[PDB]
Design brief:
It is classed as electron transport. Keywords: Brucella melitensis, domain-2, Seattle Structural Genomics Center for Infectious Disease, electron transport. It forms a monomeric assembly. The entry is titled "Crystal structure of a thioredoxin domain 2 from Brucella melitensis at 1.15 Angstrom resolution". The protein is an alpha/beta fold and about 120 residues long. The chain has one domain: Glutaredoxin (3-Layer(aba) Sandwich), CATH 3.40.30.10. Helix content is about 35%, strand content about 25%. Strand 2, helix 2 and strand 3 form a beta-alpha-beta unit. The radius of gyration is 14 Å and the shape is globular.
Length: about 120
């Protein structure tokens, strides 16, 4: 036979990449609140917040998970969750859609929104 990779491969070890294979297990069934960042390679504003989201994910380890959904790869998932422009972040808590925000923002504002949304 053959061995299994232990990670999702090169890419952020702070955030989790989500598609249809793990949206239920890693987002909807998560014990911690989960922020889902809907992004695409062509979204310049999304790129300007991606490092802040990695930092928040590392700092909030065990408290709030940060997931990444590429909308070009998961367009129906994005559409079903009402994502009609990016950047968009959604927070899920206990399988419920708790909050959203649109547009880029500095780390401080992202973190404030996460904390308020998870309250």
């Amino acid at each position: 036979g053959t061995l299994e990779a232990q990670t999702q491969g090169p890419g952020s070890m702070a955030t989790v990449k989500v598609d249809n294979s793990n949206f239920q297990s890693d987002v909807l069934q998560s014990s911690e609140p989960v922020v889902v960042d809907f992004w695409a390679e062509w979204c310049g504003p999304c790129k300007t917040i991606a490092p802040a989201l990695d930092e928040i994910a590392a700092e909030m380890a065990g408290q709030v998970k940060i997931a990444k959904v590429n909308i070009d790869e998961n367009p129906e998932l994005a559409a079903q969750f009402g994502v009609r422009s990016i950047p968009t972040l959604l927070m899920f808590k206990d399988g419920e859609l708790a909050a959203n925000m649109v547009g880029a923002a500095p780390k401080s504002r992202l973190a404030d929104w996460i904390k308020a949304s998870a309250a």
